[PDB]
Amino acid sequence: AKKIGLFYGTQTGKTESVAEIIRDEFGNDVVTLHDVSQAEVTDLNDYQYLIIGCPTENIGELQSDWEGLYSELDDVDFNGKLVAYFGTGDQIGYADNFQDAIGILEEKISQRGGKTVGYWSTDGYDFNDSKALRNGKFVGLALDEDNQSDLTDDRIKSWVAQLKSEFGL
Ligand SMILES: Cc1cc2nc3c(=O)[nH]c(=O)nc-3n(C[C@H](O)[C@H](O)[C@H](O)COP(=O)(O)O)c2cc1C
Ligand SMILES: [Mg+2]
């Protein structure tokens, strides 16, 4: 199995499109993509480095497929693993709940032993509140393909460089 397991959910495809950009950005072929509508909870056991991708749905909720997997995470042993988070979200439509989902996921996985890496500055986003907030920073990369599509490629470039360091790749 490849070094990095990237587990994403999507309804309208934008999280999946970002996921593929992230995979490519690593340059070297070190990522396997998993759609969580199709994946099993035990697939996470296969990787030391995890990337978790999730948009926020229904105003502050986990994406439906990630909702399903989340209820199965209380058993999984994340101890010693390193975990990064990315989300797509809409900071103009949902200013009070922007990227809530990666914060919900990170709260759960960090409690199970998985160490968060790849925190991301909140600079250049216009939002009011977020469960992904971690003191000046989001728990992971915030993408917005609704409002800031023109910023996605450069944000991914910069974030992947950071993760490569954290994963020692
Ligand atoms: C009804 C609905 C509610 C949403 N609520 C939020 C929200 O609470 N926070 C947020 O950041 N984005 C919210 N969004 C925007 C989506 O998260 C954003 O469009 C995301 O890219 C969709 O991902 P997908 O195309 O992979 O399904 C909402 C979108 C819809 C249609
Ligand atoms: Mg405990």
Residue nearest to atom 16 of ligand 1 (CA): 89
Q: How far is the CA of 56 from the centre of ligand 1 (A)?
A: 5
- Which residue from 133, 146, 81, 136 is spatially nearest to 104, judged by alpha carbons? 133
Determine phi and psi for 108, rounding to 5 degrees.
Answer: -75, -45
Q: For residues 26 and 81, what is the distance between their CA atoms, to the nearest angstrom?
A: 19
Pairing status of strand 61-62 against strand 56-57: antiparallel
Resolution of the entry in angstroms: 1.9
Q: Answer whether 42's CB lies under 8 Å from 77's CB.
A: no
Q: Answer whether 71's CB lies under 8 Å from 26's CB.
A: no
CATH number corresponding to 1-169: 3.40.50.360
Q: Answer whether 119's CB lies under 8 Å from 106's CB.
A: no
**CB distance 68 to ligand 1 below 6 Å:** no
**What residue type is 20 in one-letter code?**
E
Q: How far is the CA of 105 from the centre of ligand 2 (A)?
A: 15
Domain segments of the chain as ranges:
1-169
**CB distance 15 to ligand 1 below 6 Å:** yes
DSSP the chain: --SEEEEE--SSSHHHHHHHHHHHHT-SS-EEEEETTT--GGGGGG-SEEEEE--EETTTEE-HHHHHHHTTTTS---TT-EEEEEEE--TTTTTTSTTHHHHHHHHHHHHTTPEE---EE-TT---S--TTB-SSEESSEEE-TTT-GGGHHHHHHHHHHHHHHHTT-
Q: For residues 22 and 26, what is the distance between their CA atoms, to the nearest angstrom?
A: 7
The two structure tokens encoding residue 162: 């950071």
Within 8 A by CB and 6+ apart from 157, the residues are 25
Method: X-ray
